[PDB]
Amino acid sequence: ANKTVVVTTILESPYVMMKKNHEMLEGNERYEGYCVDLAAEIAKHCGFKYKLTIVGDGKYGARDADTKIWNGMVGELVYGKADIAIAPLTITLVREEVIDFSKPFMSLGISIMIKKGTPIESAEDLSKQTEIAYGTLDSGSTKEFFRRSKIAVFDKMWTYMRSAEPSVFVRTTAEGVARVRKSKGKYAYLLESTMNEYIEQRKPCDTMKVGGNLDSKGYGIATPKGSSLGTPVNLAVLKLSEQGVLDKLKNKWWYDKGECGS
Ligand X SMILES: N[C@@H](Cn1cc(F)c(=O)[nH]c1=O)C(=O)O
Indicate whether 237 belongs to the interface with ligand FWF (CB under 6 A): yes
121 binds, among its own copies, ligand X, ligand FWF, none (CB under 5 to 8 A by kind): none
Indicate whether 96 belongs to the interface with its own copies (CB under 8 A): yes
Distance CA 2, CA 174 (A): 38
Indicate whether 70 belongs to the interface with ligand X (CB under 6 A): no
How near is the Cβ of 24 to ligand FWF at its closest, in Å? 36
Indicate whether 60 belongs to the interface with ligand X (CB under 6 A): yes
Indicate whether 81 belongs to the interface with ligand FWF (CB under 6 A): no
Indicate whether 236 belongs to the interface with ligand X (CB under 6 A): no
Site for its own copies, residues 142 to 201, rule: CB under 8 A? 145, 148-151
Residue 142, annotated ligand binder?
yes
100 binds, among its own copies, ligand FWF, ligand X, none (CB under 5 to 8 A by kind): none
Indicate whether 215 belongs to the interface with its own copies (CB under 8 A): yes
Residue 90, annotated ligand binder?
yes
Which of 89, 157, 180, 240 forms a contact with ligand X (CB under 6 A)? Answer: 89
Indicate whether 217 belongs to the interface with ligand FWF (CB under 6 A): yes
Distance CA 78, CA 61 (A): 10
Indicate whether 243 belongs to the interface with its own copies (CB under 8 A): yes
191 binds, among ligand X, its own copies, ligand FWF, none (CB under 5 to 8 A by kind): ligand X
Indicate whether 258 belongs to the interface with its own copies (CB under 8 A): no
Tell me how long the chain is.
262
Indicate whether 63 belongs to the interface with its own copies (CB under 8 A): no
Per residue, the 3-state secondary structure of the chain, as one string, reads CCCCEEEEECCCCCCCEECCCHHHCCHHHHEECHHHHHHHHHHHHHCCCEEEEECCCCCCCCECCCCCCECHHHHHHHCCCCCEECCCCECCHHHHCCEEECCCCEEECEEEEEECCCCCCCHHHHHCCCCCEEECECCCHHHHHHHHCCCHHHHHHHHHHHHCCCCCCECCHHHHHHHHHHCCCCEEEEEEHHHHHHHCCCCCCCEEEECCCCCCEEECCEEECCCCCHHHHHHHHHHHHHHCHHHHHHHHHHCCCCCCCC
By C-beta, is 142 or 207 nearer to ligand X?
142
Distance CA 247, CA 238 (A): 12
Residues that bind its own copies (CB under 8 A): 91-93, 96-97, 101, 103-104, 107, 145, 148-151, 215-218, 220, 234-235, 238-239, 241-244, 246-247
Q: Which residues bind ligand FWF (CB under 6 A)?
A: 91, 103-107, 216-218, 237-238, 241, 246
